[PDB]
Amino acid sequence: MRVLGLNGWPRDFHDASAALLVDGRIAAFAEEERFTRKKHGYNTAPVQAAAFCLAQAGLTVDDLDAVAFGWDLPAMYRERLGGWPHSDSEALDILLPRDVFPRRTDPPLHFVQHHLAHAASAYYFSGEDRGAVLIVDGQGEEECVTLAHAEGGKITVLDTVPGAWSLGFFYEHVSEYTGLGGDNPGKLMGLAAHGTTVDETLSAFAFDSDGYRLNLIDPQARDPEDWDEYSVTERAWFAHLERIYRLPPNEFVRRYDPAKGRVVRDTRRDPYEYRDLAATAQAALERAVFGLADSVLARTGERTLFVAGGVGLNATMNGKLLTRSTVDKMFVPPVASDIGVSLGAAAAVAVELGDRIAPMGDTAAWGPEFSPDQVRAALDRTGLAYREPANLEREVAALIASGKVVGWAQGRGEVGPRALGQRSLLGSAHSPTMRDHINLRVKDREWWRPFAPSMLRSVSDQVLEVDADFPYIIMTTKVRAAYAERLPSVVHEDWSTRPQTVTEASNPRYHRMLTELGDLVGDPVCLNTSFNDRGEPIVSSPADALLTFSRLPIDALAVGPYLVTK
């Protein structure tokens, strides 16, 4: 079967994406924001992402066996907005506008339950027969947590928790409160490391062996003027935090900066001041999730754990789950946030149709790639001089080894929040100054933010103390003694890191580059941070990369077979 999964709706949505499964395999997969250049893919069908998928696969909607959506959208409309007004054709006309997607007839349209869709994106691509499923996000249609069982093709829901007790929402509001912003929980995760946990209950959570209990909010509490309990949980949390925490909300500040020539946003306080509140929001989250994980594992008698939902992006929480006593094996897909429920809905549908879903295979390079001719066009358009180095990987490794920062734009763009060697900014893992250089001089961002290393899987074994695939930078782990002090820019004081392991299969060109680096600095390890400027998505097109390369003091840009310097 050919199944096009979708996420993103014009009204009140985020992280639109489109994913194409063809006979179990991922033909194409991309996030709308990469094409629009507007962060987060807000309020829209994944028009361009879907456009790209069909084009990649060489298909029209008429070649499609099914279009799947990653929410029970008609059900949300019935429940929260009093009426699902559309016909499956009027639905498809909004999701796949007729002027971009011409069709002889509507394909079958499936709505897949939101958490099932998350669960699908973890299970069917993990490469494991069975396990415990733990879905933890902001909020699907009603629930905010799902504990389910994955066995022989089937996912079976055991229990759920209602939206008012969301831990995604909880985390977000703390994120907002700190001045970090609700749309930057990752930054909060990052800040935590610098904090000191005081009272992990925050005077709200009561923890137990199965999870948590939230006496601050009525669990059946619900918003009349909406279709999720965000605004509800917001008032409750914000009111609570100001009672118990020594600082009031950080407020955002809108002023005209005569140096920028714009009205820019800023925060009244330095968000670093809330590091204690951050350290504590993190600890609360870990403690709640440790309980849920334990619960769903013991009920399924499983020992492989599947995690998905926005909270599954907490690489710090993931790492601690991993080392947990109750966990032997664990899979969290790179697309654990909503961007994944396209892929998830498609999989759930493909499986119903008798398809067999193939494992991701330690890669997420499912977006757009570009011909050397196409790249050449983008360069020739700019009039910059460039080279076609005989051995791009060797020269690229030499630049990195010497402490220069290199823009790396190669192959199919990677899907998800984290760059994985398709669209990366690369630098020395070995440099004691690289971190402050990239954070402060290169990206103009907070000094306290961390960086993640890319290493050959073939030496993962000796660098990290867990001989396991870490393909997505979505799980923290500890480096071994021998490497703790060698990799100053990618290993915390803690000795923890968020690694990407690389295989020759997943990325021949990059694997080849790290290898060359090895011969230069001894370890085939490097710094690997997202390729973009403060307020943009990771770059997608060669034009996208030139543009960004233009306003960053990077040293060189390896885009396609071409090297460009400064």
Q: Which residues pair with 306 in a beta bridge?
A: 133, 331
Quick note: the x/- pattern for ligand ADP over 175-204, rule CB under 6 A, is ----------xx--x---------------
Q: Which of 53, 67, 191, 311 binds ligand ADP (CB under 6 A)?
A: 311
Answer yes or no whether residue 128 interacts with ligand ADP by CB under 6 A. no
Q: Which distant-in-sequence residues (6+ apart) come within 8 Å of 66 by Cβ?
A: 1, 2, 3, 4, 107, 108, 109, 110, 349, 353
- CA–CA distance from 307 to each of 134, 205, 293, 420, 452 (Å)? 5, 22, 9, 20, 21
Residue 428 token pair: 């020395």
The tokens 């961390």 sit on which residue?
A: 450
Measured from the CB of residue 314, what is the shortest distance to ligand ADP in angstroms? 3
SS3 566: coil
Question: Least distance to Fe ion from the beta carbon of 204, Å?
Answer: 23
Kindly state the smallest distance separating residue 159's Cβ from Fe ion, in Å.
17
Which residues are annotated binding-site positions for carbamoyl phosphate?
Answer: 418-419, 498, 528-530
* Region 230-289 residues binding ligand ADP, contact defined as CB under 6 A: 285
Active site residue 14: yes
Q: Where are the alpha helices (DSSP H) in 104-195?
A: 114-126, 167-177, 185-192
Of 14, 110, 149, 173, which is the active-site residue? 14
Residue 142 binding Fe ion, by CB under 5 A: no
168 contributes a contact to ligand ADP by CB under 6 A: yes
- The distance of closest approach from Cβ of residue 46 to ligand ADP in the complex, given in angstroms and rounded to an integer, is 14
Residue 271 interacts with which of ligand ADP, Fe ion, none, CB < 5 to 8 Å by class: none
From its phi and psi, is residue 347 left (phi > 0), alpha (psi between -120 and 50) or beta?
A: alpha
Q: Site for ligand ADP (CB under 6 A): which residue of 9, 125, 169, 408?
A: 169
* Alpha carbon distance 540, 29 (integer Å): 13
Chain positions 119 to 138 lying near Fe ion, rule: CB under 5 A, are 137
Helix residue spans in 37-113 (DSSP H): 47-57, 73-80, 88-95
For ligand ADP, the closer CB: 285 or 399? 285
Among 139, 476, 489, 507, binds ligand ADP (CB under 6 A): 139
Among 31, 143, 294, 338, binds ligand ADP (CB under 6 A): 338
CA distance 46 to 40: 11
CA distance 515 to 141: 47
Query: Nearer Cβ to ligand ADP, position 290 or 408?
Result: 290
Q: Is residue 334 a contact residue for ligand ADP (CB under 6 A)? A: no
Residues at the annotated binding site for carbamoyl adenylate?
A: 139, 168, 172, 310, 314
Q: Which two tokens stand for residue 566?
A: 């400064």
Task: For residue 28, give Cα distances in angstroms to 22, 295, 409.
Answer: 9, 36, 18
Stretch that binds ligand ADP, among 136-144, 217-225, 371-379, 445-453 (CB under 6 A): 136-144
Which CB, 338 or 544, lies closer to ligand ADP?
Answer: 338
Under a CB-based contact definition with an 8 Å cutoff, are residues 556 and 565 in contact? yes
Q: Which residues are annotated as a binding site?
A: 12, 39, 114, 118, 137, 139, 168, 172, 228, 310, 314, 338, 418-419, 449, 498, 528-530
- The Cα–Cα gap between 517 and 530 comes to 20
Asked if 532 touches ligand ADP (CB under 6 A), the answer is: no
Task: Establish if 337 lies at the interface with ligand ADP (CB under 6 A).
Answer: yes
Burial degree of 382 (CB within 10 A; 0-12, 13-18, 19+): middle
- Paired with 366 in beta bridges are none
Q: Give Dmax (Cα) for the chain.
A: 65
Name the one residue in this structure whose structure tokens are 């229990």: 159
Nearer to ligand ADP, 310 or 413 (CB): 310
Least distance in Å: CB of 20 to ligand ADP? 21
Q: Which residues bind Fe ion (CB under 5 A)?
A: 137, 338
Residues forming contacts to ligand ADP in the complex (CB under 6 A) are: 15, 137-140, 168-169, 171-172, 185-186, 189, 285, 309-311, 313-314, 337-338
Active site positions, annotated: 14
